[PDB]
Write a protein that binds this ligand. Sequence first.
Ligand code: CL
Ligand code: CL
Ligand code: CL
Ligand code: MG
Ligand code: MG
Length: 302
Amino acid sequence: ALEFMEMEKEFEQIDKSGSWAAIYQDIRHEASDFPCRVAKLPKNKNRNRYRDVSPFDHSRIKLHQEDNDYINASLIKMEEAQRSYILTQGPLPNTCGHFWEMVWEQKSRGVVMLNRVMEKGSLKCAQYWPQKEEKEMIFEDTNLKLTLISEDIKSYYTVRQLELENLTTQETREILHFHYTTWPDFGVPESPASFLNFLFKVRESGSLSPEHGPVVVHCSAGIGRSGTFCLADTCLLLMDKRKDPSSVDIKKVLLEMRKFRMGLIQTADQLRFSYLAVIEGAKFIMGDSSVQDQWKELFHED
Ligand SMILES: [Cl-]
Ligand SMILES: [Cl-]
Ligand SMILES: [Cl-]
Ligand SMILES: [Mg+2]
Ligand SMILES: [Mg+2]
């Protein structure tokens, strides 16, 4: 009856010894370092939100425009898990057209937003989507029209249906916007329940299906919260796919992902939270008594 997951035993040992900072720093020491020459070009200075957060040249997403193909976004391709994600920074006042151009060109079905437009009294990203059905947005620079079709506000997240039209061809597509609205201004969530439920909602939408382009995920820099979302998702998927689930090593998965975008998971607390999310998510998926009750009731409805 009683059996701890291997990462559960690891988690307890790290927690008991108070070594999250040491564990996290080792991951930082071992992380890949690749050039980001395009990102650093003078003409792209206003396309980057932070000088210290850039996409590697080898995995960056290229816009299909002869002028400037640059956008601060990276393709994270997880072979084994058979999952792909585009991690990007929150759009800037001048990169909203590029953002939606990327969504269009990459054939993405979903956009996952993990920050609020304003946090800690500052703007974390531009208001890049329409807030009223009757007030659509037109991005002149990339010739795209974006319309709010519907929106459903829940206590921990909001899901919006958006229609994106390429004005050049008049083709239209429906994009689902999954907005996690409750990550605290400081630190990480006390419990991974709502974040996990949110991940399950994005999964259920079909947005992560290999039949669509990669889901686009962003927070402010596109590495912290965004990194936790993809890391948790990929670890859980691997645990369901492998013959030996206890072989899934979150640290190894995180390093693999860091081969495609720098800085994924920005603090030791975010690492600890990622462990908590995977552990609790794995137990829920495994039909565990405790996790299910406290979930169905409050985590779901109410
Ligand atoms: Cl604020
Ligand atoms: Cl953020
Ligand atoms: Cl880092
Ligand atoms: Mg090295
Ligand atoms: Mg109205």
